[PDB]
Amino acid sequence: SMPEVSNPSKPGRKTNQLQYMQNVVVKTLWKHQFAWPFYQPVDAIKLNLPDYHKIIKNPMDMGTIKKRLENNYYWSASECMQDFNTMFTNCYIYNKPTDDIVLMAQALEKIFLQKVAQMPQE
């Protein structure tokens, strides 16, 4: 199923960094011409990737990340950054080195890190 975007038993809040993650990082990446394969969870049935969940045990996508930020799901920007890293790393692990989507992920991840390098201090 889709990853959880809310959890009443997980401590969450909205920090200055987390608002930067929502209003600068996600916004910048979402507008990128390479971002669309990351907008929604990988649908291994629709995409005919029958072994996707054999190889990838912790799926993540930008749609989930954006909803978690909207729900104040995270306690720290660190947690949100790790979700982005999981999303990109999953793509490198599952797909072929020569696939377009790997190149697209590499260009998106570089922008993600550029923006994180300018995140405000907590």
Binding site: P37, N48, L49, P50, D99, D100, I101
Partner: peptide, 4 residues
């Protein structure tokens, strides 16, 4: 199989 695979993506693209």
């Amino acid at each position: 199989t695979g993506k693209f």
